[PDB]
UniProtKB/TrEMBL annotation, chain A:
It is found in: Nucleus, Nucleolus. The chain holds residues 64 to 313 of 313 of the full protein. GO terms for biological process: box C/D sno(s)RNA 3'-end processing; snoRNA guided rRNA 2'-O-methylation. Belongs to the methyltransferase superfamily. Fibrillarin family. One of its GO terms (cellular component) is small-subunit processome. This is rRNA 2'-O-methyltransferase fibrillarin. Signal peptide: none annotated. One of its GO terms (molecular function) is histone H2AQ104 methyltransferase activity. The keyword rRNA processing applies. It comes from Chaetomium thermophilum (strain DSM 1495 / CBS 144.50 / IMI 039719).
Automatic annotation (TrEMBL), chain C:
Belongs to the SAS10 family. It comes from the Eukaryota. It is found in: Nucleus. Signal peptide: none annotated. Residues 1-25 are annotated as: Disordered. Residues 1-58 form the Sas10 C-terminal domain. This is Sas10 C-terminal domain-containing protein.
Automatic annotation (TrEMBL), chain D:
It is found in: Nucleus, Nucleolus. GO terms for cellular component: box H/ACA snoRNP complex; spliceosomal complex. The keyword Ion transport does not apply. This is H/ACA ribonucleoprotein complex subunit 2. It comes from Chaetomium thermophilum (strain DSM 1495 / CBS 144.50 / IMI 039719). GO terms for molecular function: RNA binding. It comes from the Eukaryota. Required for ribosome biogenesis. Part of a complex which catalyzes pseudouridylation of rRNA. This involves the isomerization of uridine such that the ribose is subsequently attached to C5, instead of the normal N1. Pseudouridine ('psi') residues may serve to stabilize the conformation of rRNAs. Common component of the spliceosome and rRNA processing machinery. In association with the spliceosomal U4/U6.U5 tri-snRNP particle, required for splicing of pre-mRNA. In association with box C/D snoRNPs, required for processing of pre-ribosomal RNA (rRNA) and site-specific 2'-O-methylation of substrate RNAs. Essential for the accumulation and stability of U4 snRNA, U6 snRNA, and box C/D snoRNAs. Pfam families: Ribosomal_L7Ae. Transmembrane segments: none annotated.
UniProtKB/TrEMBL annotation, chain F:
It comes from the Eukaryota. It is found in: Nucleus, Nucleolus. This is Bms1-type G domain-containing protein. Belongs to the TRAFAC class translation factor GTPase superfamily. Bms1-like GTPase family. BMS1 subfamily. It comes from Chaetomium thermophilum (strain DSM 1495 / CBS 144.50 / IMI 039719).
C-alpha cells in the first residue's frame, strides 16, 4: 500500500488549501497541518523538511464525505483559507480537523455537535486547534448558539436526519451571508429508505430550492459510499461571493 | 582551517567539479560576520591564514 | 455454419453476456464494490486528477 | 447511560426477530470486537447493544464509533435474550447486522432503523 | 519612541499565499527523475495497476515539495518500510523493488521488434548475396 | 556534422558511478516501454 | 447518473413522476379523457 | 450477401513462399510489400521534384538576414573534399575565454 517511509511529492490541488501528494503507486489527498507533529485520530501524515514545522495530513475519503466529494470532482468547495465555515454534524471532530486545516489560522470553524461524548472528543481537538470553536447544542434549534456564530460564508451539513433540509434551512436563514456557499451530504437510506436514491436526491434538491437555495452542482460520490450525494448550493444568489 | 566543518560540501564539489564552499566553522566568528558580499569570502581567507599562524 | 460452444446453451450465453456487460459498466460509471478494505486506506490506488469536474451541473 | 433504550411494546421482540433472521441469512456479526470492526469498516446498517452488561462501559464505547459513522444503535435489555436470538450458546452483548445489495431482509432493516431513528 | 526609518527601496511569486507557502520547485536532476517516474508510473506497475491518464506537455509543476509518509498509528507491522528499504528518492525505491528483470525482458522484446528489419538485416542479406 | 576530435568539455567529464548508471539504465528501459505502450494505444484508438 | 444500466433507468419505480406538457394537456382535455385516471390506467400504477 | 456464403466460401487463401533453392535472395515480394516499396519511392520522388522546382525558380539576388549568421553551402572548390550541399549547423560548442578556462582547469 502507501507504506510509512515512502517518498511522495506534494503538489497543490485545484482547490485552495488542499494538496495532492503523489508518489510511486498511490496518489493521496492531504491538507496542511495546523498543529504540526501530532495526529488527531492516528492518520498517516506527511513530513517535509524544507531547505520541521511543515507537515501535511492525509484525508481519508472513506471516512470523510468532503474528501469523498473532492475526489469525486466538485467544481468548488467554497472554503478558501480565511473563510468562516459552520459545520453541522461535527461528530467527534475527524473531518472538522481537515476543514480547520483548510481554512487556516485566519479562518474559523464553528463545529456543532449534539451528543455529549462526541462533544468531549470535539472539545479535545478544538483545544488543539485554535480556530475551531466547539458548540455542543442541537442543530435543530439554532437559537442556542446565536451568541456564538457570526455570519459565516460556508455551511457544511453532514447530519443524517430526515428533517435535514429544514435544519439546514433554518441554520442558513440565521447564519449565512447573502450568496452563501454550502455543501450538504444527503444519505438516501436515511432520508427515505423505501424510495430510489435518485428520486430522494431530486426531492431534497427541490426542498432546498423551496428553502431559498439555488443548487449549482450535485455528485453521487459512488466509489467511496453507496447511495450518498453531495449537493453544492448558493444561498440567495446565483454567484458565490458577489 | 578555512573550510574545516564544510567538508561534506567540499568533497561533494571536488568530486563533481562544482564550486567548493568558501568557509567552514570560521563563518560564525565575529570578524567575518561584519563583512558583506564578496568581502566576506576575502576576510574568511585572510582570517584563516592568520588563524593558522 | 460453425457456431460456438457458448451458443449451444442459451443460459451460459446469457451468463457470459451479463458478465461482460457488467464489465463494460465499470468502464463508464463507478461501481461501489466495497468500501475501504480490511487493510485500511492505501491511498487512492489509481491516480488523482485535479482538473476534472465530474458533477452534474444543475 | 443508555439514552436510546428500547421500550417494551413489541420493539425489542421485533429487533430480536430481525436479529435471528439476519443470523439465518449469515449477515450478522456477533460480539463487541466484531461490531466495532464492522462499524469501522462501514458495512453496518444497524447495531443492537445489550443493556444488562456487567459494567456497561463496553456498550458505552460502541456508540461513539456509531455516532461518528452515523449508523443507528439501540439497546435491548437482555444479553441472554440476545445470545438466544442469535443462536450462540453464549451471552452476546453487541450485535451488528450488515448491508447487502440484494435481500428481502433489508425491508425489515429499513423499517427497524426508521423506528430506531424515531426512537432517538 | 520614534526612530529614523531604514530606507529599503532597492515577476512570478515564490510561495503560494493561498496554499500555505509551498516553495517553488528547485528543479534538481533527482526531482526531474522523480517527476518522469510519476508520469510513467503506469509502466512501473506493469499492468497490475493502471492510472489516470494525465498527460500535459510539461510534467514538472510549478510548486512541489518532496515529503515522506510518517506513520499511521493504527498499522505499524506491515504498513511500515524497514531500514533496508527506506531509500532516498522514488526511483531508488523502484529499482530496489522487484520486476526489474521484468522491465529488462520487456525492453529486450521491444529491442528485437525494433531491430527486426532495419539495417543489420540488410547487411546480412547483402552478405548472403555476395557469398 | 558529427565531431571527430574530442573537445575539452568532453575530456573533463566526470566518470559517473554505479548507482547513477543503474538509475540511468532503469530510466531508459521505462521510457522505451512507455513509448511502445503509447504507440499501441494510439494505433488501437485510430482503428476504432 | 446512478441507477442507469445502459439506457435502462432503474430510478423510475411506482409512484411514477410524470411531467406534463401543454400539448399533452390540451389534447387530453380535448379527447374527453381524465388525466390522472387515464395515466393510472395506462401505467397500472400510482402516478404523481 | 454475407449470410449466403459458406465457411468454405469464407476460407482464406494462403500465400506461397520463396522457393527454397532461391531463399538466399530475400523474401518474395508480393502485392503488399510492393505497395510499400512504391509508396516510399513516390514519396521520395515527390520531395525531390519539389526541391528541383525550388532550385530552378530561385532568385539569384535574394537577401535574408540569416545569411549574416550562417555559413553557406559553398561549392566543392571553396569547401573542399568535405563538401555536402547541406548548410552546416552548430553543435553548441563555443570558443571559451581564458578566465573561464582558468576556472575550469582549477576545478579539474
Amino acid at each position: 500500500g502507501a507504506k510509512a517511509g515512502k517518498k511522495v511529492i506534494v503538489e497543490p490541488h485545484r482547490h485552495k488549501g488542499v494538496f495532492v501528494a503523489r508518489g510511486g503507486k498511490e496518489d493521496l489527498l492531504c491538507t496542511a497541518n495546523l498543529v504540526p507533529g501530532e495526529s488527531v485520530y492516528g492518520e498517516k501524515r506527511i513530513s517535509v523538511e524544507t531547505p520541521t514545522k511543515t507537515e501535511y495530513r492525509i484525508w481519508n475519503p472513506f471516512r470523510s464525505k468532503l474528501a469523498a466529494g473532492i475526489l469525486g470532482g466538485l467544481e468548488t468547495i467554497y472554503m478558501k483559507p480565511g473563510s468562516k465555515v459552520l459545520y453541522l454534524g461535527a461528530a467527534s471532530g475527524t473531518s472538522v480537523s481537515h476543514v480547520a486545516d483548510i481554512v487556516g489560522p485566519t479562518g474559523a470553524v464553528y463545529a456543532v455537535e449534539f451528543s455529549h461524548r462526541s462533544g468531549r472528543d470535539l472539545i479535545n481537538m478544538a483545544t488543539r486547534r485554535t480556530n475551531v470553536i466547539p458548540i455542543v447544542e442541537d442543530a435543530r434549534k439554532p437559537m442556542a448558539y446565536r451568541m456564538l456564530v457570526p455570519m459565516v460564508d460556508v455551511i457544511f451539513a453532514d447530519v443524517a436526519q430526515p428533517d435535514q433540509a429544514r435544519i439546514v434551512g433554518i441554520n442558513a436563514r440565521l447564519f449565512l451571508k447573502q450568496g452563501g456557499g454550502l455543501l450538504i451530504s444527503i444519505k438516501a437510506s436515511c432520508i427515505d429508505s423505501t424510495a430510489p436514491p435518485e428520486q430522494v436526491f431530486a426531492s431534497e434538491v427541490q426542498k432546498l430550492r423551496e428553502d431559498k437555495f439555488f443548487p449549482k452542482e450535485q455528485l453521487t460520490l459512488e466509489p467511496y459510499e453507496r447511495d450518498h450525494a453531495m449537493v453544492s448550493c448558493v444561498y440567495l444568489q446565483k454567484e458565490f461571493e458577489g | 582551517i578555512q573550510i574545516l566543518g564544510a567538508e561534506k560540501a567540499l568533497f561533494r564539489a571536488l568530486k563533481t567539479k562544482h564550486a567548493t564552499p568558501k568557509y567552514g566553522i570560521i563563518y560564525h566568528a565575529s570578524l567575518v560576520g561584519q563583512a558583506s558580499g564578496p568581502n566576506k569570502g576575502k576576510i574568511a581567507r585572510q582570517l584563516a591564514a592568520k588563524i593558522a599562524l | 455454419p460453425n457456431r460456438k460452444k457458448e451458443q449451444r446453451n442459451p443460459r451460459v450465453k446469457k451468463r457470459k453476456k451479463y458478465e461482460e456487460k457488467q464489465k463494460k459498466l465499470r468502464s463508464v460509471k463507478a461501481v461501489y464494490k466495497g468500501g475501504e478494505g480490511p487493510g485500511g486506506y492505501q491511498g487512492e490506488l489509481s491516480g488523482i486528477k485535479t482538473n476534472l469536474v465530474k458533477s452534474v451541473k444543475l | 447511560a443508555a439514552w436510546p433504550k428500547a421500550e417494551d411494546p413489541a420493539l425489542v421482540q421485533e429487533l430480536l426477530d430481525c436479529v435471528q433472521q439476519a443470523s439465518h441469512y449469515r449477515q450478522l456479526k456477533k460480539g463487541a470486537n466484531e461490531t466495532t470492526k464492522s462499524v469501522n469498516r462501514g458495512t453496518s446498517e444497524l447495531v443492537i447493544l445489550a443493556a444488562d452488561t456487567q459494567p456497561l462501559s463496553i456498550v458505552l464505547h460502541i456508540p461513539l464509533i456509531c455516532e461518528e459513522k452515523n449508523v443507528p444503535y439501540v439497546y435491548v435489555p437482555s444479553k441472554v435474550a440476545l445470545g438466544r436470538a442469535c443462536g450462540v450458546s453464549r451471552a452476546v452483548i453487541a450485535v451488528s447486522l450488515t448491508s447487502n445489495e440484494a435481500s428481502d431482509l433489508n425491508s425489515k432493516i429499513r423499517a427497524l432503523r426508521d423506528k430506531v431513528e424515531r426512537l432517538a | 519612541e520614534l526612530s529614523v526609518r531604514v530606507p529599503q527601496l532597492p515577476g512570478p511569486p515564490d510561495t503560494l499565499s493561498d496554499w500555505y507557502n509551498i516553495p517553488r520547485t528547485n528543479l534538481t536532476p533527482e526531482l526531474k527523475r522523480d517527476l518522469q517516474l510519476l508520469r510513467m508510473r503506469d509502466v512501473v506497475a506493469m499492468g497490475k495497476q493502471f492510472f489516470k491518464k494525465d498527460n500535459r506537455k510539461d510534467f514538472v509543476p510549478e510548486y512541489c515539495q518532496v515529503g515522506t509518509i510518517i506513520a499511521g498509528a493504527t498499522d505499524g507491522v506491515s504498513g511500515r518500510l524497514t531500514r533496508k528499504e527506506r531509500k532516498r528518492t522514488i526511483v531508488e525505491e523502484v529499482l530496489s523493488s522487484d520486476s526489474v528483470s521484468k522491465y529488462k525482458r520487456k525492453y529486450h522484446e521491444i529491442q528485437e521488434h525494433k531491430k527486426s528489419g532495419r539495417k543489420g538485416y540488410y547487411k546480412k542479406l547483402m552478405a548472403a548475396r555476395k557469398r | 556534422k558529427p565531431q571527430k576530435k574530442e573537445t575539452y568539455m568532453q575530456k573533463r567529464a566526470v566518470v559517473v558511478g554505479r548507482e547513477e548508471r543503474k538509475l540511468r539504465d532503469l530510466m531508459q528501459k521505462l521510457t522505451t516501454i512507455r513509448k511502445e505502450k503509447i504507440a499501441k494505444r494510439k494505433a488501437k484508438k485510430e482503428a476504432q | 447518473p446512478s441507477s442507469m444500466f445502459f439506457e435502462h433507468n432503474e430510478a423510475l419505480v411506482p409512484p411514477y413522476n410524470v411531467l406534463v406538457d401543454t400539448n399533452f394537456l390540451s389534447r387530453t382535455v380535448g379527447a374527453k379523457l381524465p388525466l390522472l385516471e387515464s395515466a393510472m390506467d395506462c401505467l397500472y400504477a400510482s402516478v404523481n | 450477401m454475407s449470410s449466403l456464403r459458406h465457411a468454405i466460401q469464407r476460407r482464406a487463401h494462403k500465400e506461397r513462399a520463396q522457393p527454397l533453392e532461391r531463399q538466399r535472395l530475400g523474401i518474395l515480394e508480393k502485392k503488399k510489400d510492393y505497395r510499400l516499396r512504391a509508396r516510399d519511392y513516390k514519396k521520395k520522388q515527390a520531395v525531390l521534384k519539389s526541391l528541383r522546382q525550388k532550385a530552378a525558380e530561385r532568385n539569384e539576388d535574394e537577401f535574408y538576414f540569416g545569411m549574416m549568421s550562417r555559413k553557406g553551402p559553398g561549392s566543392a572548390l571553396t569547401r573542399g573534399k568535405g563538401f555536402t550541399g547541406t548548410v552546416d549547423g552548430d553543435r553548441g560548442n563555443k570558443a571559451l575565454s581564458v578566465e573561464t578556462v582558468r576556472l575550469l582547469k582549477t576545478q579539474d
